[PDB]
Structures are given as C-alpha cells and as structure tokens.
Amino acid sequence: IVGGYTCGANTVPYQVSLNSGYHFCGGSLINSQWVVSAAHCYKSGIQVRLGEDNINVVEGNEQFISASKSIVHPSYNSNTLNNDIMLIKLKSAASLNSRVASISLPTSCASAGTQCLISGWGNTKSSGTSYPDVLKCLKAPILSDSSCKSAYPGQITSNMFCAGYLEGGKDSCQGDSGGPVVCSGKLQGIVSWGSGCAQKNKPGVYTKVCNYVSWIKQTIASN
Numbered sequence: 391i392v393g394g395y396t397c398g399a400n401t402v403p404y405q406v407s408l409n410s411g412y413h414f415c416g417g418s419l420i421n422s423q424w425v426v427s428a429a430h431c432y433k434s435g436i437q438v439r440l441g442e443d444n445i446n447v448v449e450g451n452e453q454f455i456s457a458s459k460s461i462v463h464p465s466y467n468s469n470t471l472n473n474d475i476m477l478i479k480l481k482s483a484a485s486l487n488s489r490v491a492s493i494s495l496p497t498s499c500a501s502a503g504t505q506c507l508i509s510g511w512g513n514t515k516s517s518g519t520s521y522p523d524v525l526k527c528l529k530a531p532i533l534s535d536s537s538c539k540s541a542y543p544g545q546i547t548s549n550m551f552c553a554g555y556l557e558g559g560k561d562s563c564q565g566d567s568g569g570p571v572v573c574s575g576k577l578q579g580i581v582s583w584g585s586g587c588a589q590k591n592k593p594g595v596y597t598k599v600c601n602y603v604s605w606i607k608q609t610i611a612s613n
C-alpha cells in the first residue's frame with residue numbers, strides 16, 4: 391500500500407495472508423472455512439494465515455491453516471484479468487473471535503464516490519521495493535466508470551472498477567493482490583491490477599465482487 395497508514399493490530403479481522411514460505415498475496419475470510427482472493431494469486435502449497443499483524447513475528451492470535459482446495463473462476467483470463475477471483479476452502483474451520491472474523495458479501499454494487507478501506511502487506515514505494523512487517527491501510531473512493539475507462543481505454547470490463555486518486559501518491563501495489571476493498575461493511579472489491587503503483591492518472595483496478603455473489607454461494611454450497 392503506498393501512501394497509507396498502519397492499521398493497528400487486528401483492526402481488520404477478516405484480512406488473511408497467503409503464505410508459501412513468505413507472504414505473496416492477501417485475501418478475505420467470508421465464513422469459517424472459506425476465503426476469497428484473486429485468481430492470479432493461485433499456486434499450490436498455500437497456507438492461510440489468519441489473525442496477523444506483524445507477518446514476521448508470532449505475536450499471538452495467529453491461526454495457520456492449510457488450504458484444502460483453491461477454486462479459480464472457470465472463465466478467468468490471465469491476459470485481461472477478467473474474472474480475477476478465487477475461492478480457497480480451509481482444511482479445518484477457523485476459530486472466529488474478535489480478532490478473526492468474516493466479512494459480509496454485498497447485496498448490491500457500490501456507487502462511484504463510496505469511500506472504502508483497502509489493506510495489505512504489499513510494497514509501500516511507487517518507485518522501489520519496501521515491504522512492511524505490519525498491515526497497512528488506505529481509505530480510497532470508487533471512481534466513476536467514465537474516469538476509469540478514460541484512464542485504461544479498452545481494458546476495463548463490467549467485472550472491474552477503479553478506486554483511488556488520479557493525482558497519484560496513494561494506491562495498492564504488488565503484494566496487496568487478492569486483498570479486500572470493504573465499503574460500508576461489505577466486501578465490494580479484490581485487489582487485481584494497475585499500471586505501476588500510485589502513478590498519476592493510473593488508479594488501481596479491482597474485481598467487482600457484487601457480480602459474483604450467486605457464483606460464490608453456489609460454488610460453496612457444492613464443495
């Protein structure tokens with residue numbers, strides 16, 4: 391997260407870290423046995439780490455659970471990143487409490503102007519590489535579709551939305567992929583892509599979760 395602030399330990403209880411010997415992506419807990427992340431974060435050997443703040447120190451509250459299966463959306467396109475969503479089923483259910491809790495799925499899509507909270511352990515430099523030890527947060531608004539399409543002509547599909555600042559300076563970045571964009575207590579986005587990080591007129595693009603609720607529900611119901 392570039393230009394963000396330190397969230398505070400366990401203030402984002404639904405945030406998870408996908409780990410394979412190091413942190414490579416973020417995700418969101420939606421019930422005690424399932425997590426939603428980005429399809430481009432897929433790999434084998436994923437351990438889901440819940441209740442984290444400093445990812446390099448065991449401080450207490452952590453729960454390390456292996457993924458039993460990862461379900462990448464069948465129509466995921468890695469060239470355009472259309473349908474960039476993945477569901478992970480945990481080997482055992484997590485113990486939910488105030489530090490580990492699930493986030494709700496939306497019942498309707500969000501409007502331009504909605505202020506949301508984006509979080510993660512990704513890079514904090516637009517020009518460079520600095521990964522933090524603790525979780526970073528950023529409050530950012532959803533932009534209008536015209537501004538988004540004008541910034542990335544020909545690359546935005548109806549399953550994506552832009553959020554951020556056109557002046558640059560504040561944005562999500564590599565390492566934040568798969569993490570949550572929460573607005574009014576509902577999970578509306580998943581960190582997907584962008585041109586560099588925090589560049590002027592190049593906001594972050596996110597997977598539009600409201601378009602996938604029936605799919606998530608049906609898939610969880612059959613697995």
Ligand SMILES: NC(=[NH2+])c1cc2c(I)cccc2s1
Nearest residue numbers: 562563564583584586587594
């Ligand atoms: N500018 C951005 N919001 C992002 C830039 C990236 C990059 I560079 C890699 C992976 C994910 C993201 S999100």
Ligand SMILES: [Ca+2]
Nearest residue numbers: 444445447448
């Ligand atoms: Ca830790």
Ligand SMILES: [Cl-]
Nearest residue numbers: 539543544545
């Ligand atoms: Cl267009």
